[PDB]
Design a protein around this nucleic acid. Structure first.
Length: 114
RNA sequence: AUCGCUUCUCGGCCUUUUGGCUAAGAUCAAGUGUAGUAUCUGUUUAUCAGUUUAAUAUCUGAU
């Protein structure tokens, strides 16, 4: 059995959050060594190109593949859509604001003047 | 313990949100007494007796 934890911190740079998300997505993927070997026995030495070494024009993908990336796109898009968790419209406390822009400005002022 | 779904709670974003300047740009606010106008609003009580009138009505009188 296995165990780990990862706590959230400051967004410090957009890079940090991006990196966390990449970690998760990367861990998810599971590759088929079948297709890997199939692709391998055709091309051989072309498999291991340096930045500058080797070249074959284009690798054309079966559509079924393309569907995988499209699906992952939609998933990540949703997960990103949920970035900001909204606090429910609570009327219970005292109202001094005149509109929602004013309500939010009063909230930002509450953070900076204690 | 792990995975997923749902419910509530909390933290983080919340710049995504206070058009620029000058001589704070400059200045300041009084009253319903009289009438009338206009608009809505309401209308064109029950007999009978008389007075009256072209006829109504009015007037008078009990309801």
């Amino acid at each position: 059995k296995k165990k780990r934890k990862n706590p959230d911190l400051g967004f410090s740079d957009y890079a940090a959050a991006q990196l966390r998300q990449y970690h998760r997505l990367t861990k998810q993927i599971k590759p088929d060594m079948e297709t890997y070997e199939r692709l391998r026995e055709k091309h051989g030495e072309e498999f291991f190109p340096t930045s500058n070494s080797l070249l074959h024009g284009t690798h054309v993908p079966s559509t079924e593949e393309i569907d995988r990336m499209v699906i992952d796109l939609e998933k990540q898009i949703e997960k990103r859509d949920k970035y900001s968790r909204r606090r429910p419209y609570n009327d219970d406390a005292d109202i001094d604001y005149i509109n929602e822009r004013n309500a939010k400005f009063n909230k930002k002022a509450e953070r900076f003047y204690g």
